[PDB]
Symmetry: D3
Subunit: 282 residues, 6 copies
Amino acid sequence: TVAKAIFIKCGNLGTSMMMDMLLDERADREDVEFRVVGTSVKMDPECVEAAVEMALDIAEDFEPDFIVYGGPNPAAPGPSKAREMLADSEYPAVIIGDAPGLKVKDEMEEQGLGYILVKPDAMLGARREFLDPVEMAIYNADLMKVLAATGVFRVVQEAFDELIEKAKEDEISENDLPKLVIDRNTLLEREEFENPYAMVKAMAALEIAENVADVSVEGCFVEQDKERYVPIVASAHEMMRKAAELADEARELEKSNDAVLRTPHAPDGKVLSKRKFMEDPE
Amino acid sequence: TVAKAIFIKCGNLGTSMMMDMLLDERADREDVEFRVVGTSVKMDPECVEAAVEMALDIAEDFEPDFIVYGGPNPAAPGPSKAREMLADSEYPAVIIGDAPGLKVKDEMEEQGLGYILVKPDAMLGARREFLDPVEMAIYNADLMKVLAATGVFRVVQEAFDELIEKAKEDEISENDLPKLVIDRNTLLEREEFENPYAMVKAMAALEIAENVADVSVEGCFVEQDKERYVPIVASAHEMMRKAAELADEARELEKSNDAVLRTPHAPDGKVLSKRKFMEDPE
Amino acid sequence: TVAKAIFIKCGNLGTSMMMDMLLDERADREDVEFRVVGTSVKMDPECVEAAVEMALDIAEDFEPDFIVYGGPNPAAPGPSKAREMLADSEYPAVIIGDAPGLKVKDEMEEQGLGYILVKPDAMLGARREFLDPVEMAIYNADLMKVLAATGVFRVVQEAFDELIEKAKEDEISENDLPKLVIDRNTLLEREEFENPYAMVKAMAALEIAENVADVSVEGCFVEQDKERYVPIVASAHEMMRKAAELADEARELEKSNDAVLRTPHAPDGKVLSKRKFMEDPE
Amino acid sequence: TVAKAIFIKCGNLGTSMMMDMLLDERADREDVEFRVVGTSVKMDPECVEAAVEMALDIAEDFEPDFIVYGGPNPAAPGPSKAREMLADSEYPAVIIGDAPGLKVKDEMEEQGLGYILVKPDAMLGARREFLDPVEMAIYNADLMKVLAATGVFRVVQEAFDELIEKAKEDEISENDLPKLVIDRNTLLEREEFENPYAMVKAMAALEIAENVADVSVEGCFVEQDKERYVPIVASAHEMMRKAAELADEARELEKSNDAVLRTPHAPDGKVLSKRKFMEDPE
Amino acid sequence: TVAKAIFIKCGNLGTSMMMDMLLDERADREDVEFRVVGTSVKMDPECVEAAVEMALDIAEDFEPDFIVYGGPNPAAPGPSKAREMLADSEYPAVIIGDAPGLKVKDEMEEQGLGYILVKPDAMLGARREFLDPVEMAIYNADLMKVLAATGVFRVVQEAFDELIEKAKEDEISENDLPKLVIDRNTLLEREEFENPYAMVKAMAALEIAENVADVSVEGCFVEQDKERYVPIVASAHEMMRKAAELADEARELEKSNDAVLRTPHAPDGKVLSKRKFMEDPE
Amino acid sequence: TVAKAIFIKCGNLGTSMMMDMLLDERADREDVEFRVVGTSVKMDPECVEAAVEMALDIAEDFEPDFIVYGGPNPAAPGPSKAREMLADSEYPAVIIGDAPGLKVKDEMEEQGLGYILVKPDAMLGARREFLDPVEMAIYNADLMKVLAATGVFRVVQEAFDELIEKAKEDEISENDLPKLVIDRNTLLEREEFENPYAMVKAMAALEIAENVADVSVEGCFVEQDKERYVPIVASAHEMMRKAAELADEARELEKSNDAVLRTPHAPDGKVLSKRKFMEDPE
Ligand SMILES: [Mg+2]
Ligand SMILES: [Mg+2]
Ligand SMILES: [Mg+2]
Ligand SMILES: [Mg+2]
Ligand SMILES: [Mg+2]
Ligand SMILES: [Mg+2]
Ligand SMILES: [Mg+2]
Ligand SMILES: [Mg+2]
C-alpha cells in the first residue's frame, strides 16, 4: 500500500523547504507518492488561495491521504486563508509553521488541523538594504544546518512517518494529527545524542536560533531608522551563523565517539537505525 | 507588466531548491508571479511526466511567459521525458541541471531549450548505510552555502532576471534562452569579489564541490563492497563541508574590507547594487 | 585634584569584577585613589550590611567623593539593604547591576542613587551538579571577553571617568550621577568600531549574552527535574562561549583594518585615544 | 565550625582576581565567611600599607583564622612591606604571587609565611601606547581561561580548602601553611585530565603563559624604543590569546570523552567530585 | 646486518623531501647507513645525469644494497634519463614519483625498476607571479602535513623497511622491489585509524590533494591569460591548505580516542607499534 | 656568470630542509647551479666526516664559490668536525644551525666561517615513545609553516642571494660571509608585513617556536622518568602546532589587506617584488 500526500509551500521556512524530502531521502521508497505545489515566496491571501486551489484541484484525481501546508506565520492573512480552506475540506491536514503560529493554536485545534510549530525556524533579516538573494541563501544554509544537526528534522521525520503508517490503513483521525511545538527543550527527551555535551551544544544552538526571530522582528517591523535597523537585521544573521557552528560542533562530538545517529528509510518505508559508522542500519 | 513563470522540481539539486526564491527574496516584487510544482525527490519517468502534466495543465489558465525544469541529470530517463514534453510545448523553457547534463547539451539546443548546468552542484553520497534524512539536509546546507557565498547563485539570479525583463515584453525567443555552464572558472570574470583571495578561496570551494560528484558516483555506482563504499560516500560529504568553510572564509574576507556585494530587487523588479554595509542599494 | 572613591563588591558580576581597574589600568594615575571592600560571593542582607559598614567606616577618614556598590540583582534583599544605607549617607552613590536591576530603576532614582545596569552581564548556571569553581572561572573569562571586546567596558570606563571629573570640581550633585542601561543597542550610538561587521558581530555577542540570563534562570529556579536542569544550565554556558568567540571575531576584524580603538589614561587622568597600532595616543 | 579569612588585593594577578571566589562558587557554603579589601591596582608601599592596615583593623572584630595577600611580585617594595606587616601580625598568612616571587621564597619561609606562586600568571604588556582598559580586560579574560581550564585554579582551590579544614581546629601551625610553586609540570602530578592529549595541550598552554612574562618584561622594562616595544608587548598578548585557545581545546577534548572533572563544594564545605555530565557529584 | 642505500633527489616532491628521514627518525638505527645526493630543484636531463653520476660514483666504495631516485614526473626527460642509468646498473633501484609517473609504469616494470607513485603528492602552482620561495615553503608545509597525518608516509616507511630487511638477507631480486601506487583508496586497506571519521576525513584530504594537481597543471601549462592563471594556481594552494586542515582534524579525532598509531624504529631497526599515549611501543 | 654552491645536510633542521630550494623556487634560474650531499639524519663525527669528504671530493671538478653546512647544533661533535674541515678547506663556507650554535659564534668567527643561526628552528621531541616517522613529519610541517609564513625564510633567501651576487665576482672575502642570528626580534627590522597585527602575531609564533626547544631539551636530556618525559615532549609538539596556527593567522591578515609580500626570482637571478595579488612582480 502506497501513502499519498500533497505539500503546499507558500513563503519560506527552513522546515517547509525540507519537509517532504526528509521522508524519502534517496527517492527509493516504494510506499509513498507526493505532489508539491506552491507560489514560491509569496504568501499573501491571493497567492495562498491560488496555491491551495491548485492542491485541491490535484487532490480530486490524486486522492491524497493527507495535505500539508508549510510556511511562515500561520496567524498571518495568507496562511489563515489556507487554514480556512483546508479545514473546510475532507482531507486530513497539518500546518507547519514557526513561533508566531502559537497565537492560533486554539483556532487550529477547533479547525481539526494538526500542526508542527518550529520555534527555532526564525524569520530572517528581511530589509532591502541587507537581504539580497545571496544573503537569503546563506542564512537558509545556516538555519538548515541548525535544524538538521540538532535533530529537529528527525522529530519532523518521525511525526510524518507515523502519519504515513496510518495513511496506509486509511485510518487518519483528527486525533492522529500532530500537535507539536518544537524548541530547545524538545531535545532533552530525544535519544539523539550519545555525548551529553553534543546535546547541550545543540540546545544552545536552538536557543540562539529561536532568539534570532526577535531581532529580525525588531529590525523589520519596529525600528524605522535605517542607521539602526540595517545593523540590527545583520546582527540576527551573525547569530544564526554561530548557531550553525554550535550544531556543527555537536555533530563533530558524535563523530569523535563514532555515535552519529542515522535513521534511513528502507525501500518498504521502514525507518531503520544505526550509530556506529560501519554498522548496517536495522 | 507582470512576468509569469512555472518552476518544476523533480529530484533535488542545490540550485533547483533555491532557483525561484533567488528572484523575489523578500516577496515584495510587484512584477512577477510564479507557480511551483513537482514530485519531491522522485524523478523517474512516471513521476516526471506527472509533474510536467501538472505544470502544463496549470499553464492553460496561468499563461506563463516561460517554464523552468530543475533537478539532477538532464540526461537521465525522467528528466529526458520532461525535456521532450517541454520541447513539444509552446512555452519557452529552461533546464537547470548538473554536470551530467553536458551529455545532452546538443539535444537540448536542438529541442530549443535553454539550460544552466551547474557543475559544482554535486550529487550526494546516496547509500542507505550513510545517507539518512538528517545527513541529506546537512549536505544540502553545505552545498547551499557554497553556491551562495561563491556567487554562483548570483549568476543564476542574473540570467533569470534578464529573461524576466524579456518576458514582460512577450519577446522571449529561443536565442534569448540561456546556454550556461557554470564552474570554478566562471568566477574569473564576475565582479563578485573586491578582495582577490576571496575570489581564489571561492574558486577552490567550487573546484572541491565539483570533485565531490566523482566521489559520490564512485561510491554509489561503481564500488560494490560496503566496507569500501560507505567510507567513500562519507568522504565526499567531508569534502563538501570543507568547501562550505572556504566559501565562508571568502565571505568573511569581503566583510573585513566592508565590500560585501549585495544585489537586492526593488519592488518594481530593478536589480539594485551596493558594497559598503551602510550604503543604500541603487 | 585626586578624586577618591570606595568600591563595594558583594556577589559577582563581570562588570563588578573589573569596574575599578578599568579606571587605572597601569596603576599610574595620580588624580585618583581607591579603596575596595566586600564579602566576596556572599550577598545576603547580613553580609551586605557588613560590607557597607566597612565602606562607611573607612569613608570617615578616607573621605570618598563617591561610593560604588556592585553586584548582582539590585532588587534582591541584600543589595536593597545596600541602596538603603547608601542613599541615606553623605556620599553620592552608584549601583552597578544586571538586568534584574531594571525592576527597581525608578526606586533608585527616587533614592537619589546613580546606576549602570548591564543587561549582557548574565547570571551563570549556578547548579551544584554543573558549576564548580573551574566552570565558574571559565564562564567569567568568556563574559569578561564579551564585555571588553564589544566595548561595553569602555562605556563603563567613560561613565566613571566623567564622574571623576565632576568630583574634582567638588560639585557632585544627583544630576551628575550616571543613569545607564547597557545592552546590544548601546553599540548603535557609539563609534567603537571602524568596521561595520565588527559592530554587528559585537551586537550579536551582546544579544546572546543577554539571552544567557533567561536560560540560567530557568535552569536554576524554574526547572526542577535534574535530568533537565543540568543540561539547561550547561547550554547557557555554551552560549556564552560562542558570544566570546563573536566578540573575538569582531576585534580581529578591527585588527585587519589596523583600527583597534584604544583609550588609555594619562598620568593626570585625561583619556587619550588612538586607532592605528603605531599611532601615539593623544 | 565557621572558618574566617581576609583577602587583601593590591595590583592585579589572575589568581588574586579569583582566589576567594574559587572557595564558594555558588555562595552556599555555611562553613566560611570572608572579607576582601585592597587598593585596586595600586601596589606601591603607601597603598599596600593602607591595604594591610584596613585588613588588620577589620581583623580585630572579624577574628580571621588566616589572612591572604595576593598581587604581583612578592619581591617588589609594596608587597615586601605587606610581607613584613603580616609576618609581624598575630595572623597566619599566605602570599599569592607570580614567578618574580621565587626571588624571596627563602625569605618568606623565614618570615613564617605560606605562599602560592603561580608561574603562568604572567605580567601583561603594560605600555601606555598599547594597554588601555579594554586591552587589559581582554588579556585577563584569556589568562583566566588558561588558569581555569588547565586545572591551575583547582590546585589553588584545594590548597585553601585544606587550610580551611585546619583552621576549623583553631590552630594553624606554620607547618600547615602552603608552600606551592605552580607551573606547567604541576600537571604531571595531578589527575586533572582523563584524556592524555588534553593534559599535554594544557601543559603547552601553561608553558606559553609562563613565557609571556619575559616578553612583557622586555617590552616594559628593557626596550626603550617605542617602535620596538609596542610590537613586543602586543606580541605577548597574542601569545596569551593562543594559550587560552589551547586550554579551550583541552577542555573540549575532555567533553568529547564525557570526562570533565567537576569538584563543587557542598553546603557544609565538603568538596564533591564527578566526571560524567549526568552523574551527581559525590 | 647494516643495510646501505643512496637516495638521489632532483626537483622536489613532498615524498622525496622526507623519504630517507622516515627510515631513521631519531638517527639511532644501527642497521642502516644512508647517503643522499642531488642537484636541488633542477631536474633537467643534464642535471639528473650529474646526480646519478654522483650516486654511481660513491656507490663504488659505499656499496649500497639499493639506490632510490625521487622527484617529480618520472616520465619527463630528466627522470627518464635516471631510470635508464639505474636500470642498467648493478644496484636494484626504486623510483619515487607523483601521478604523471603512471604514464611510464609498465615501462618501469620492463626496466626492472621498483616504484612508489604518490598521487596526492601534487605539483604546486609554479607561476612566477604567485610562487616565490615563501609560498613554495608554505605549500610544502601543508602537503607534508597531509602526507604525514593521513598515514601516507607510513605506507612509504613500511615499503622501504621491508626492502631493508630483504636487503640484509643479501637477496634483493626484482620480485622484491616495491610496485606501489598510493591514493585516497589506499587508506581503505589499512588499519591506520581507530576512529572511522578520522579515516574518512583523511580520505577527503587525499582526494583534495590529488585534485590540486589538475588545477596547478591548468594554471601552469594550459591557461595563458595572466588575469586567469594567477588566480587559478593560487586556488590550488588554497585547496591544499584545506586538505592539511582535514588531515589535522583527523589526527585530532585519534587524539580524542587516545588512539594515535605510532610505529617508531628500535635501535636494531625493528618497527615497534603503540596506540595509547602512555603505552610503551612493542 | 653562473654561481655554484654545495650544500651539506647532516641531521635535520627546518632551515636546512629548505635552504637550497629557497634560492630557485621554480628551477628557472640560469645564474646558479647546486649540488646537495649528506648522510640523512645521522650527524655523528663519522658520518659528518664522510659527508664533508663527499662534498670536498665533488668540489674538485664542481668548483663551487662557497659551501654550506646545515644541521642542528654547530657546537656538537659532528658539526664541530665539519666546521674544522671547512675552515681548513679552500672554500668560503657558511654554517646554518639553531640556537645551541650561539655557544660557538666567536669560534666560527675565528675559523673564518659565516653562519646563520635560527633560534626558532627548535629541536623536536625525540623520545622513542613519542616520536615515530609520522610525528616527526607533522612537527616539521608545522615548523616549516612557521619559518615560511613569519618571513624567516625570506631573511635566509636574502642572505644567500647577497652572497651569490658576491660570488659572481669570483671573490668572496670572509667579510662577505653572513653572520646572522634570527629570532622573534628580527621582524622589527624588516618590512615583511603591511598589517602590524600580522607582524605581532608572527613575532608571537617565533617566540613560541623558540621556546619549544627548551621543552624538548628537558624531555629528551633532563627528565628520566618516562611518565613525565613523554608528556613533556608531546607538549612541545602541541606548542609548535599552535605557533603554526599563529603564523597562518598572520598570513590570512595580509591576504585580507591584499598585501602579501612575494619576492620571486627572475630567470637571471634578480629578486623581484610585489604586494598586490594581481600585480606583476618587478
Ligand atoms: Mg477532516
Ligand atoms: Mg471539525
Ligand atoms: Mg487509529
Ligand atoms: Mg518555442
Ligand atoms: Mg525547434
Ligand atoms: Mg529580443
Ligand atoms: Mg525518568
Ligand atoms: Mg581585458
